[PDB]
Amino acid sequence: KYIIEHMEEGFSEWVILEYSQILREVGAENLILSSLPESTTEKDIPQRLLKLGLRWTTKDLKGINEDFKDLELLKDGRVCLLDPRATIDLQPEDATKFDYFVFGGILGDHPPRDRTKELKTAYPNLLISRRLGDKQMTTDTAIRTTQLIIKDRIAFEDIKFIDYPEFRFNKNEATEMPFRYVLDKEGKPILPEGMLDLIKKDS
Amino acid sequence: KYIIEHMEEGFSEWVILEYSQILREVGAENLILSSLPESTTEKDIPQRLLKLGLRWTTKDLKGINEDFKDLELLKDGRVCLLDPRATIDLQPEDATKFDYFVFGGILGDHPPRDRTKELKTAYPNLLISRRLGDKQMTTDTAIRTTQLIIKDRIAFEDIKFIDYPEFRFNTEMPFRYVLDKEGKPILPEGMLDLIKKDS
Ligand SMILES: Nc1ncnc2c1ncn2[C@@H]1O[C@H](CSCC[C@H](N)C(=O)O)[C@@H](O)[C@H]1O
Ligand SMILES: Nc1ncnc2c1ncn2[C@@H]1O[C@H](CSCC[C@H](N)C(=O)O)[C@@H](O)[C@H]1O
């Protein structure tokens, strides 16, 4: 159901924390990590994700069925590409329309590689583009949101968010995260396990 | 979130494969394995389940919040106990009604111990009982079904099942099973070998 195009070279601690959280919230059978470098083997995947059962592949969108027997084929118009630049928000009623939710992004910098657009250009008949509100989200937030709209059938504007949360570490260090986050029951922003400590040590 | 009451002594390969499948399909965040023996420690929990991030506890329903502060409080009427002898079938619109779905069963045998009744009795105000069809399901199938009804909002009679499938190896399973796209019953990874090995 959820397909993440791996958006970096190697795996930083940050992306390991995100992917870990995603895995524990959707379950390993429901996430495919795709488009990894062609040379990638098991020894290249962080063992923390392997233990959690991460399904990964070097293949791309059209080729993933070749790597997984259980995966229903990719039909035209039933694959939703998620893009903050799209004009139509994802709706609860879309639960019927899509069998796959794809996350692209921007790979690297200097130059950057807009994978979202390249996908859009590679799969003109496959992809439908949808937005998750007018603010930028992290991958685990974007997935949590997709899951809230599609599985819990809650419309976007009924979801409680916080934008640009500020985290205070000491009397000196005040950092602000330039993203929208889903609130938890106690009114605080949901981050992956370990993310907070990671942000702290960055200061 | 799903709460599974651990319904056998120790961990057989059978239940390990069943629990693994569940964890991979719903996510380890969304499952609590409860009511384990008081002596139980992490050392007694199978490694394959710990790697997948199994959340387990010796506690029962009343004390589940104590072990996991991230969980929403259990409120009366918002906890559904899944019971094949119950009267009202679980329906898609119940997705707004419940925060928890509990799976009990029989801690047999000689004598057996019906945890389903024990629960239903120890927590009368807490629990509401729902059925998943008139046939018996494995826990992984019952969770799979609860998920289709609650998360995908698919009605029970619109789910495609197979009743009492036979498996030839050169065996009939007395359960109802959900079908996959390929028309075959959906079993936990590794279960077919274990069924075969037993023959
Ligand atoms: N508001 C929004 N609407 C739709 N998708 C969004 C979104 N905010 C984030 N996303 C998803 O999350 C992804 C960005 S997270 C990508 C991080 C990567 N290291 C990079 O540099 O780009 C996007 O590809 C998109 O799929
Ligand atoms: N048709 C049905 N309707 C509602 N719940 C069901 C069901 N079939 C199975 N379940 C639930 O799924 C669980 C798995 S059966 C558990 C196995 C255990 N050895 C025992 O005999 O009890 C059961 O506890 C039951 O409560």
Numbering used by the authors:
A (entry chain A): 2 to 204
B (entry chain B): 2 to 171, 176 to 204
Cite, word for word, the article reporting this structure.
We show that indeed Sfm1 consists of a typical SPOUT domain at the N-terminus flanked by a small C-terminal domain (CTD). Sfm1 exists as a monomer and exhibits a negatively charged surface surrounding the active site unsuitable for RNA binding. Consistently, Sfm1 has no activity towards RNAs but can specifically catalyze the Arg146 methylation of yeast and human S3, and the CTD is critical to the substrate binding and the activity. Sfm1 is the first SPOUT protein that can catalyze protein arginine methylation.
The crystal structure of a C-terminal truncated Sfm1 (Sfm1ΔC: residues 1−204) in apo form was solved by the single-wavelength anomalous dispersion method at 2.0 Å resolution and refined at 1.9 Å resolution, and the crystal structure of the full-length Sfm1 (residues 1−213) in complex with S-adenosyl-homocysteine (SAH) was determined by the molecular replacement method at 2.5 Å resolution. In the SAH-bound Sfm1 structure, both molecules are well defined except for residues 1 and 205−213 of molecule A and residues 1, 172−175 and 205−213 of molecule B, and the C-terminal his-tag and the linker are disordered in both molecules. In the SAH-bound Sfm1 structure, SAH is clearly defined in the electron density map. SAH binds to a pocket formed by the three connecting loops of the trefoil knot (residues 83−92, 105−115 and 131−140, referred as L1, L2 and L3 loops, respectively), and assumes a bent conformation, similar to that in the structures of other SPOUT MTases. The adenine moiety of SAH has largely hydrophobic interactions with Pro85 of the L1 loop and Leu133 and Met138 of the L3 loop, and additionally the N6 group of the adenine moiety forms three hydrogen bonds with the main-chain carbonyl groups of Leu133, Gly134 and Lys136 of the L3 loop. The 2'-OH and 3'-OH groups of the ribose moiety form a hydrogen bond with the main-chain carbonyl group of Leu83 of the L1 loop and the main-chain amine group of Gly105 of the L2 loop, respectively. The homocysteine moiety interacts with the main-chain amine and carbonyl groups of Ile107 of the L2 loop via its carboxyl group and interacts with the main-chain carbonyl group of Met8 of the β1-α1 loop and a water molecule via its amine group. In the SAH-bound Sfm1 structure, the two molecules in the ASU are related by a pseudo two-fold symmetry (about 180°) and the intermolecular interface involves mainly α1, α6 and η1 (or the equivalent loop) of the SPOUT domain in both molecules. Structural comparison shows that the apo and the SAH-bound Sfm1 assume very similar overall structure (root-mean-square deviation of 1.2 Å for 202 Cα atoms); however, the SAH binding induces some notable conformational changes at the active site. Particularly, on the cofactor binding, the β5-α5 or L2 loop, the following α5 helix, and the β1-α1 loop move towards SAH by about 3.0 Å.
